[PDB]
Amino acid sequence: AQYEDGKQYTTLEKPVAGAPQVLEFFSFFCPHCYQFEEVLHISDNVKKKLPEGVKMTKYHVNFMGGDLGKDLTQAWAVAMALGVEDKVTVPLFEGVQKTQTIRSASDIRDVFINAGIKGEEYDAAWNSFVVKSLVAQQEKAAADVQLRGVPAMFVNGKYQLNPQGMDTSNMDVFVQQYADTVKYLSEK
Structure with a gap:
């Protein structure tokens, strides 16, 4: 087939129930994550x-x-709670x-302050049990798929994107293949 398990994606032998439709993991320390974002x-x-x-979820x-990790x-939990992901990423x-x-x-x-979030609002969020539980979610989602590498994307808790199986001659073409692969998996 054109899309083949083990090539543009892999299947989790242990599917995760109730998982977010499109679930992406990253780290601000992760060099391919930087490329993926910027x-x-x-x-x-x-x-x-x-x-x-289809909702998209992104976790640190x-x-x-x-x-610091x-x-x-x-901090990413604070960003999700305040809805300021697009200003601090x-x-x-x-x-x-x-x-x-x-x-x-x-x-x-400092990054949040400079982005216009007020200290008071940031510190209150940071110390809040809503953020506590948002940190819990990030960990449990990563735990569910025993995650040891980023960037990673999982579709409906059963397919994991495999970017090493896509050509990187052309950056544009890589991105479209990646996205088209997510779409295919979505419709699966």
């Missing part, structure tokens, strides 16, 4: 090709960058990987 805009091109009725992971997962990536000015939880906070 250069390729994968998440955005996937959405443009997804059906009607703990296993990169030790203590965990801070970043909590780029400065967090650049602060961690480009300028390397994110070295503590306080520096993470």
